[PDB]
Design a protein around this ligand. Structure first.
Ligand SMILES: [Cl-]
Ligand SMILES: [Cl-]
Ligand SMILES: [Cl-]
Ligand SMILES: [Cl-]
Ligand SMILES: [Cl-]
Ligand SMILES: [Cl-]
Ligand SMILES: [Cl-]
Ligand SMILES: [K+]
Ligand SMILES: [Mg+2]
Ligand SMILES: [Mg+2]
Ligand SMILES: [Mg+2]
Ligand SMILES: [Mg+2]
Ligand SMILES: [Mg+2]
Ligand SMILES: [Mg+2]
Ligand SMILES: [Mg+2]
Ligand SMILES: [Mg+2]
Ligand SMILES: [Mg+2]
Ligand SMILES: [Mg+2]
Ligand SMILES: [Mg+2]
Ligand SMILES: [Mg+2]
Ligand SMILES: [Mg+2]
Ligand SMILES: [Mg+2]
Ligand SMILES: [Mg+2]
Ligand SMILES: [Mg+2]
Ligand SMILES: [Mg+2]
Ligand SMILES: [Mg+2]
Ligand SMILES: [Mg+2]
Ligand SMILES: [Mg+2]
Ligand SMILES: [Mg+2]
Ligand code: NA
Ligand code: NA
Ligand code: NA
Ligand code: NA
Ligand code: NA
Ligand code: NA
Ligand code: NA
Ligand code: NA
Ligand code: NA
Ligand code: NA
Ligand code: NA
Ligand code: NA
Ligand code: NA
Ligand code: NA
Ligand code: NA
Ligand code: NA
Ligand code: NA
Ligand code: NA
Ligand code: NA
Ligand SMILES: [Sr+2]
Ligand SMILES: [Sr+2]
Ligand SMILES: [Sr+2]
Ligand SMILES: [Sr+2]
Ligand SMILES: [Sr+2]
Ligand SMILES: [Sr+2]
Ligand SMILES: [Sr+2]
Ligand SMILES: [Sr+2]
Ligand SMILES: [Sr+2]
Ligand SMILES: [Sr+2]
Ligand SMILES: [Sr+2]
Ligand SMILES: [Sr+2]
Ligand SMILES: [Sr+2]
Ligand SMILES: [Sr+2]
Ligand SMILES: [Sr+2]
Ligand SMILES: [Sr+2]
Ligand SMILES: [Sr+2]
Ligand SMILES: [Sr+2]
Ligand SMILES: [Sr+2]
Ligand SMILES: [Sr+2]
Ligand SMILES: [Sr+2]
Ligand SMILES: [Sr+2]
Ligand SMILES: [Sr+2]
Ligand SMILES: [Sr+2]
Ligand SMILES: [Sr+2]
Ligand SMILES: [Sr+2]
Lengths: 172, 160, 142, 132, 337
RNA sequence: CCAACC
RNA sequence: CGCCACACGGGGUAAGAGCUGAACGCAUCUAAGCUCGAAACCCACUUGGAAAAGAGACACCGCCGAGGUCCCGCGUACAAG
RNA sequence: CGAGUGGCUUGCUACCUCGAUGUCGGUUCCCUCCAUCCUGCCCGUGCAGAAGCGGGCAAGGGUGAGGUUGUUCGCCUAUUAAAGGAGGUCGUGAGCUGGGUUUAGACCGUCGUGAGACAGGUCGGCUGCUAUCUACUGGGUGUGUAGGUGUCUGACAAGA
RNA sequence: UGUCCCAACGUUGGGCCCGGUGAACUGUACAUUCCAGUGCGGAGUCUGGAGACACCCAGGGGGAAGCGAAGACCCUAUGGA
RNA sequence: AGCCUGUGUACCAGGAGGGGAACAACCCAGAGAUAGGUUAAGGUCCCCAAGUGUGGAUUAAGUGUAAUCCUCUGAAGGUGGUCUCGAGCCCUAGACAGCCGGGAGGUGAGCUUAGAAGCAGCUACCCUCUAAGAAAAGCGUAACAGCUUACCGGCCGAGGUU
């Protein structure tokens, strides 16, 4: 099978070996697309994903390679963003960005600060109780968002009662 | 007692009641369920539970499978639903158990079982096109209580 | 420390067992062989099960001893020894005229033996001797 | 528990008979167990200055005898070491009966108590006549 | 039901044989952080005494109070970093590449080695620097030796030689740092490396006891009660089950006990001085008198008096440093009594 | 449990 | 029976929590990819270890003499050795 | 009701051993298994919390002291994070013990005309050997690598 | 009251080294073994691997279903007392 | 049961040699000596003589690389893991899914009830506008409200579904 993806005018896509790099006004994203007998390549103004095999396993990755590339297109132009709302009940939760990691303090009244390192060149901006995660690499951005949320996960007590934590509000 | 002790046909046919005494009573409550005043011909659908391996089924197992099957047909079609199911086999084979080492080992009589050849119909139901899946479900439950794997074969039924 | 090898084999991207089988055949025919870039040799399959097997060999043992190698260096050589009657005279001689190296200590480039090459573009389930060694706890000196 | 403030060489074991240094009506106590303790194979459970122990009353008033109670070791013959290196030892081994809250069941204590025991059990201390 | 119980003795210090080098050999060194510096020193055990100290611990209920502490007096005179050895990285690990020696040698270093008469410190240095440019240089260490003569209580004059890694800033900087030391005469001291209050790991060959039985050597029980009068008093029950049909090396048996290398971790250095402040009246038993560079190590140190002990900056400290503890008293009371 | 006679 | 000392930190995982993600336009923690995650695995630490047969490395000394043995006084050592 | 796994119990068989492979319980000392009692990390809840209850990963470490009884098991007591189970000739008598069992003496009950019998009870009642080989714990002498001194490397190996 | 917790130090005679004296038990053969398997189902010797340079000293006894005694139990004998 | 006890037969016993890792009776094979040659069972990547043989397909579990067997396990039950073959129905008059828009009036049906308005219960379940839109399929409310399924239209464009 063969799939052709016309690359956006705003974007330029270079690729060597199993690595593919995409660049736009919003930045660049490089990914390795490696699977048995699936050849990815840049043919002029279009990226081509093709293979001589057509079994369910191959078709699966092909469709997977496409969305990965179309996401890279989107990220280098429009960019990717996730919104998050910090919610707390009794203890005022302090959420701040320090260096390459978002730090949280006074979670449920904890003396020890919880933290996580931001992935990629992902940018994290907080405005009061709102938080926005964004960048060109959907992988790094999506994970950073997820990490922030997971960072306030609780297994010890009934969540329905203890709901404090930062949550993903909007997904791109 | 495990069925592994009696599921195989590895002994002579032992059914002559004129030469066997003390045979326990069968636990099978009924062989004809549903509306038995009606004929099987009055139904558009006929589904049978077919055994895939030749085996012996102790009367205790027949009662369990028949029960968990019909019980479902009652719960889903009512104590008087328009259907009829039949358990066409009867436990004629008398079983023993040697319960004194290997001396004078001929066992005492402990039960009965029905010999079923692979490919045969153990149960057969007759229903309306509506309750076709309810009977297929009653059988799924029944074949979980008898040794062999089974085929739920649909005879008259071209409503696919 | 200088090894006049009549043959220099390049194990990079090559199936370990297939190279081993041929290096043994040649060693018995009197050839002096040097296998190079062992850390890059490859073994097909699911990495998790492969490693579980080599980890078991490492854990096995007792007072008599079952010294199993962890470096790709030794892993490969042991692999070859298992294809040689190393306890017989001709077998120990063959085995002793075969050496394995991390990287390539020669100026020449090794040759790729036919039938032993693995195409990375057609295979995703395989591991690298070096990777195995690292997992085993070897000190990645290569 | 709160650091004792001195190193102790346990001078007592399960089954040891000691003096009940109070006015509860119990004269002699038998060590049965040591709170928080867990030994090793064949090792007889040991207790010393500062430990809380379960005890049974071997000698005393009818009402007290045979009762299984909690107590606190206040004195022992085996030496203990204080921060300045000096060893300290008493004339006998003695414990004070105590309740679920570690308050002395009795009203008065008899004989001296080690200061270290005071730290741990203040209410026990606020009953001591002499603290050495 | 056969209660459980940990085995007798540790399996981590074997085989329990006689040590090959009476001079300890560290098998690990501190990490490279601060400025370049020699990562170790040595001395000779003299004996013990005690000292009253002011509780330094900021988390102790006794902070600021008198505290008696046991101390082992080690005579730590100056040593001489006599050479600079360079290791290169290779497929088979680290290997010595070359050494840069000096000219000034202690008068009796010739009781152990064949002192160099003709050497090229620049050709050596040259080869080393080329190794760094190439990026094949492994760590850098100094061939070091003691000066037994400086110690009257120790009869040996023959110096003890050991290699001590040099860690520090960047390699270029500590390589230069190494070369400097060596060139002079290599004469360095305890002060140069340690500060009173820091934690050091001490290594040494324990006191020898020759052959000893399982009871003493492994801590197995003696036979008990009736089992102690039938003919067996200090012998273990059995050498193993019927199967496996062999005696495992894990069963406690008789053999060499003592005279093994041991590395004792986190020993706090209470004080580093010089003179006779720590000496004891009558002299340290079986040793003599102290009056020179000395170190007071908190607690015990492996080995008998006169044995060579080695110091290294603690590689796994549990507590932060509390420099220069206040010593209000140092016992000089006779040790005989 | 048990290590023979039942 | 006395006294001293015996981590922290890394790396990869299980169960599990998730991200991106298609087969199946959607959905999906999984099929490829990835972020995490156990007293458990590896490393860290201690001990042995040139007989590792690929039987090792470096420096200096020496080949008419470097070094060593016997011998003598002794123990930080030791059943002989 | 149906399907299995284990090889701890019991039964069955009579394949091995009667020119003998000493028998229960305990003890001592070593290795192991996981179907996990505690400890680490998780999932669910009839999960507010605290705590329970159930489930998953997981064998690194731990799982102790006592009263009756030869007892195993078990019953019981106070402690405990917990005081898990099992394999190793029901590990371990050329290691120990000798309470039980298991000769010869003796008694009771029952049985027997009697001699005498009883995994019924009861009191007493014998445990040999200087290690050849192998195995391991430690200690030496040689040869090999191939003049000497000193210093190291680290394949492997052990640890809780 | 060291039976025990929990073991320590010491004494005498041995043990160890040296001179002299100088047996016995046991011996089909080979024999440096270890892990599994196989086999009359309980192997140093068979099979597959692993390990293994030779010799010697001391040791406590895991194995040689160790040595010592044609099993005292049980059964069988047209046996004995 | 590698059990007990029959029966017919060939084998071991008393049967080598070749193969089966080893292995009384499983396979080839019945064998004077010596010699050349060709096969049998079985095998041809190395150990070890002969293929890293050819055309093709499947498997990703190291499944498997194990004729027979005390010896080689693997079951009832389950599987949108994957490959292949067939039948029915729907579809460029636009299917399946997704996303957007519409989902409306008589009327909050009648009854029951203080109240019940799609949705407590009972009964009925009719017709307007229209390209659709139930006397309402599931949540939701004290009852409303509110959120959706049906049903229709659009965007999309090729197989979809049982
Ligand atoms: Cl080993
Ligand atoms: Cl061989
Ligand atoms: Cl693959
Ligand atoms: Cl207790
Ligand atoms: Cl004992
Ligand atoms: Cl014939
Ligand atoms: Cl494999
Ligand atoms: K016998
Ligand atoms: Mg809870
Ligand atoms: Mg005990
Ligand atoms: Mg003194
Ligand atoms: Mg004094
Ligand atoms: Mg027999
Ligand atoms: Mg015997
Ligand atoms: Mg488990
Ligand atoms: Mg373990
Ligand atoms: Mg036994
Ligand atoms: Mg024995
Ligand atoms: Mg005996
Ligand atoms: Mg003996
Ligand atoms: Mg008795
Ligand atoms: Mg008796
Ligand atoms: Mg009897
Ligand atoms: Mg006889
Ligand atoms: Mg008799
Ligand atoms: Mg007679
Ligand atoms: Mg015969
Ligand atoms: Mg060949
Ligand atoms: Mg398998
Ligand atoms: Na009978
Ligand atoms: Na493979
Ligand atoms: Na191993
Ligand atoms: Na004796
Ligand atoms: Na035995
Ligand atoms: Na980790
Ligand atoms: Na079974
Ligand atoms: Na026993
Ligand atoms: Na465990
Ligand atoms: Na008991
Ligand atoms: Na036995
Ligand atoms: Na005995
Ligand atoms: Na016994
Ligand atoms: Na005594
Ligand atoms: Na032995
Ligand atoms: Na007679
Ligand atoms: Na024949
Ligand atoms: Na053969
Ligand atoms: Na396999
Ligand atoms: Sr039969
Ligand atoms: Sr079935
Ligand atoms: Sr070949
Ligand atoms: Sr050293
Ligand atoms: Sr080391
Ligand atoms: Sr005795
Ligand atoms: Sr054995
Ligand atoms: Sr996971
Ligand atoms: Sr050598
Ligand atoms: Sr015999
Ligand atoms: Sr498991
Ligand atoms: Sr737990
Ligand atoms: Sr009992
Ligand atoms: Sr038993
Ligand atoms: Sr045992
Ligand atoms: Sr007795
Ligand atoms: Sr009895
Ligand atoms: Sr009797
Ligand atoms: Sr030779
Ligand atoms: Sr062999
Ligand atoms: Sr002996
Ligand atoms: Sr081929
Ligand atoms: Sr093919
Ligand atoms: Sr068998
Ligand atoms: Sr089979
Ligand atoms: Sr199945």
């Amino acid at each position: 099978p063969r799939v052709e993806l016309e690359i956006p005018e705003d974007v330029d896509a270079e690729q060597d070996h199993l690595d593919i790099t995409v660049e736009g006004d919003n930045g660049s994203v490089t990914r390795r697309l490696w699977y048995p007998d699936i050849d990815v390549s840049v043919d002029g103004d279009t990226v081509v994903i093709e293979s001589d095999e057509d079994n369910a396993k191959t078709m699966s990755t092909i469709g997977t390679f496409q969305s990965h590339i179309e996401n890279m297109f989107h990220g280098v132009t429009e960019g990717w963003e996730y919104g998050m709302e910090v919610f707390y009940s009794h203890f005022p939760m302090q959420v701040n960005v320090e260096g390459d990691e978002v730090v949280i303090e006074n979670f449920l009244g904890e003396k020890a600060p919880r933290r996580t390192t931001i992935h990629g060149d992902t940018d994290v901006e907080i405005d009061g109780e709102e938080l926005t995660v964004s960048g060109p690499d959907i992988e790094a951005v999506g994970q950073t968002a997820a990490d922030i949320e997971q960072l306030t996960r609780i297994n010890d007590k009934d969540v329905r009662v203890f709901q404090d934590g930062v949550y993903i509000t909007r997904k791109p | 007692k495990p069925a592994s002790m009696y599921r195989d046909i590895d002994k002579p046919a032992y059914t002559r009641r004129e030469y066997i005494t003390g045979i326990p009573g069968s636990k099978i409550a009924q062989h004809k369920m549903g509306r038995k005043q009606k004929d099987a011909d009055d139904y558009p659908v006929q589904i049978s539970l077919i055994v895939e391996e030749t085996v012996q089924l102790r009367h205790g197992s027949l009662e369990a499978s028949r029960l968990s099957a019909n019980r479902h047909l009652i719960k889903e079609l009512g104590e008087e639903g328009d259907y009829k199911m039949t358990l066409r086999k009867f436990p004629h084979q008398v079983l023993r158990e040697n319960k004194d080492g290997m001396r004078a080992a001929f066992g005492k009589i402990v039960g009965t079982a029905a010999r079923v050849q692979a490919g045969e119909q153990l149960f057969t139901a007759y229903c309306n096109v509506e309750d076709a899946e309810h009977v297929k479900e009653a059988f799924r439950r029944a074949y979980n209580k008898i040794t062999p794997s089974c085929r739920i074969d649909s005879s008259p039924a071209g409503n696919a | 420390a200088e090894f006049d090898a009549d043959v220099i084999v390049d194990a990079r991207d090559c199936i370990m067992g297939r190279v081993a089988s041929q290096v043994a055949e040649q060693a018995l025919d009197g050839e002096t062989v040097a296998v190079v870039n062992a850390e890059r040799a490859v073994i097909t399959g699911r990495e998790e099960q492969i490693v579980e097997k080599y980890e078991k060999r490492v854990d096995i043992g007792n007072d008599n001893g079952y010294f199993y190698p962890k470096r790709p260096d030794g892993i490969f050589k042991r692999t070859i020894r298992g294809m040689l009657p190393h306890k017989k005279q001709r077998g120990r001689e063959a085995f002793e005229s075969v050496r394995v190296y991390l990287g390539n200590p020669y100026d020449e480039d090794g040759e790729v033996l036919d039938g032993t090459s693995l195409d990375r573009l057609s295979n995703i389930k395989f591991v690298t001797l070096g990777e195995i060694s690292e997992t085993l706890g070897a000190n990645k000196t290569w | 528990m709160e650091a004792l403030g001195a190193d102790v060489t346990q001078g007592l074991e399960k089954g040891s008979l000691i003096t009940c240094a109070d006015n509860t009506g119990a004269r002699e106590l038998k060590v049965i167990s040591v709170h928080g303790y867990s030994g090793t194979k064949n090792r007889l459970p040991k207790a010393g200055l500062g430990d809380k122990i379960t005890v049974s009353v071997t000698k005393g008033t009818p009402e007290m005898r045979r009762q299984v109670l909690e107590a606190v070791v206040v004195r022992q013959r085996k030496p203990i070491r204080r921060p300045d290196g000096t060893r300290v030892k008493f004339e006998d081994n003695a414990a004070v009966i105590v309740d679920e809250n570690e308050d002395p069941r009795g009203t008065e204590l008899k004989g001296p108590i080690a200061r270290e025991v005071a730290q741990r059990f203040g209410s026990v201390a606020s009953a001591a006549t002499m603290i050495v | 039901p056969q209660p459980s119980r940990p085995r007798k003795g540790s399996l981590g210090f074997g085989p329990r044989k006689r040590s090959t080098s009476e001079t300890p050999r560290f098998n690990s060194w501190p990490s490279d952080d601060g400025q370049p510096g020699v990562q170790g020193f040595a001395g000779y055990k003299a004996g013990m005494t005690h000292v009253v100290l002011v509780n330094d611990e900021p988390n102790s209920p006794r902070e600021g109070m008198e505290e008696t502490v046991p101390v082992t007096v080690i005579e730590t005179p100056p040593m001489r970093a006599v050479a600079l050895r360079a290791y290169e990285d290779t497929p088979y690990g680290q290997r010595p590449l070359t050494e840069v020696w000096t000219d000034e040698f202690h008068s009796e270093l010739d009781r152990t080695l064949d002192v160099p008469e003709d050497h090229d410190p620049d050709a050596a240095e040259e080869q080393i620097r080329d190794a760094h440019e190439a990026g094949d240089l492994g760590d850098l260490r100094l061939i070091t030796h003691t000066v037994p003569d400086a110690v009257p209580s120790v009869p040996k004059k023959k110096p003890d030689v050991m290699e001590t890694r040099v860690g520090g800033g960047s390699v270029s900087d500590r390589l230069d740092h190494a070369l400097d030391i060596v060139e002079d005469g290599g004469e360095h001291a305890m002060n140069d490396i340690f500060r009173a209050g820091e934690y050091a790991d001490v290594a040494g060959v324990t006191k020898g006891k020759g052959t000893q039985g399982p009871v003493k050597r492994w801590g197995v029980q003696k036979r008990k009660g009736k089992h102690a009068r039938q003919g067996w008093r200090r012998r273990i029950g059995n050498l193993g089950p019927w199967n496996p049909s062999r005696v495992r090396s894990t069963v406690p048996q008789q053999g060499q006990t003592g005279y093994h290398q041991r590395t004792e971790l986190n020993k706090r250095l209470i004080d580093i001085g010089e003179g006779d402040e720590p000496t004891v009246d009558g002299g340290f038993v079986n040793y003599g008198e102290v009056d020179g560079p000395y170190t007071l190590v908190k607690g015990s140190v492996p080995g008998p008096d006169k044995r060579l002990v080695r110091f290294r900056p603690a590689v796994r400290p549990n507590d932060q440093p509390r420099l220069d503890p206040e010593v209000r008293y140092v016992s000089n009371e006779s040790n005989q009594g």
